[PDB]
Amino acid sequence: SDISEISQKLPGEYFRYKGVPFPVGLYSLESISLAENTQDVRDDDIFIITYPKSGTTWMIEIICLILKEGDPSWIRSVPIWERAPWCETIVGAFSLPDPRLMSSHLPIQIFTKAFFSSKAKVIYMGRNPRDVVVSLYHYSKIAGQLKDPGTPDQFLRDFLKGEVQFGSWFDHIKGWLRMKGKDNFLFITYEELQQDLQGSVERICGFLGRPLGKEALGSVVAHSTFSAMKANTMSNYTLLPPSLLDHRRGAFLRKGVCGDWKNHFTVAQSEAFDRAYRKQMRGMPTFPWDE
Ligand SMILES: Nc1ncnc2c1ncn2[C@@H]1O[C@H](COP(=O)(O)O)[C@@H](OP(=O)(O)O)[C@H]1O
Ligand SMILES: C[C@]12CC[C@H](O)CC1=CC[C@@H]1[C@@H]2CC[C@]2(C)C(=O)CC[C@@H]12
Ligand code: NA
Asked: What end-to-end distance do the CA atoms of the chain give, in Å?
């Protein structure tokens, strides 16, 4: 009823915090400021950081299963957004009572500053920016906090100019990779999980210091699969208020594959995009999505 009243009042617009665009209604100068400056960062805290639409949900479910050592009970009975609350959202983990698992879309220059001097763990996940553009385009049409994308072509110019929620994808990931090297930082991609979920899971277990038996492992893998996840009412967001997410028009877990961009980018849009990528990612290393 509280979340319901809020959802129906969403303008579908943006406001800015230190130069970055944030959706109006689900974020505030204060909700963000709090996450940025809070001192409450713990040694065993766990953060999942991503640029929107990179497969956050997938990562969140994977760790919820790892923490419960494969027992689906927790993900079947508790809402996904409650198991790994968002830091910057008006109703965030920092504006709630009590291993803490948290989620965030904040770019490194705004993320909880007290982190850099802590032992908390951060898993950063990246996805092919092209597939992110698609996922985000569709999701915008059904997400109450987001403005309509407009034409695929205009939405792409907005994306390339960082004129979208959370700013530039380029800046976002370039900034966060600056942590690559600290032992309490893990960088993994949506593409790696797609190519070998089990391998990725074991990897993430090593990183977290939480080994699993061929048993629990198999369970985490089974329940993390797209098909399984889209069927879990607590994980597929079908419980959210229609205004916040138009279930009548689409699903949060849309397709769940790599390369859908190829059915959405025209060759002209693809070429323009590559020039923008080529210029912004000049010094960067090679990623799975770099063919
Ligand atoms: N278990 C899973 N397997 C594959 N894709 C998954 C997934 N869980 C979530 N996703 C995909 O991740 C995207 C949502 O990202 P986020 O959680 O960061 O908002 C969606 O992409 P698509 O729109 O391409 O289908 C969604 O289907
Ligand atoms: C939009 C967002 C925040 C951004 C995520 O990538 C997707 C998401 C899922 C559920 C939303 C949450 C914002 C905070 C909300 C509104 C809650 O308090 C419950 C449902 C939550
Ligand atoms: Na919308």
From this structure: 48
Task: Give me the resolution in angstroms, 1 decimal.
Answer: 2.5
Token pair of 92, please?
Answer: 């965030």
Alpha-helical segments (H) within 78-195: 80-83, 129-142, 152-160, 169-176, 190-195
CA distance 170 to 115: 22
Which residues span the domain enclosing 129? 1-291
How far apart are alpha carbons 147 and 165 in whole angstroms? 10
Q: Tokens in use for 229?
A: 């996840």
Which residues have their alpha-adjacent CB atom under 5 A from ion ligand 3?
143, 146
d(CA 204, CA 283): 27
47 is annotated as contributing to ligand binding: no
- 224 marked as part of a ligand binding site: yes
Whole-number Å distance, alpha carbon 137 to ligand 3 midpoint, is 10
17 CB within 6 A, ligand 1? no
Q: Is the CB of 53 under 6 A from ligand 1?
A: yes
Indicate which atom in ligand 2 lies nearest the CA of residue 145. Answer: 1
Query: How many folded domains does the chain comprise?
Result: 1
Is 138 considered catalytic here? no
> Residue 65 belongs to a domain with what CATH number?
3.40.50.300
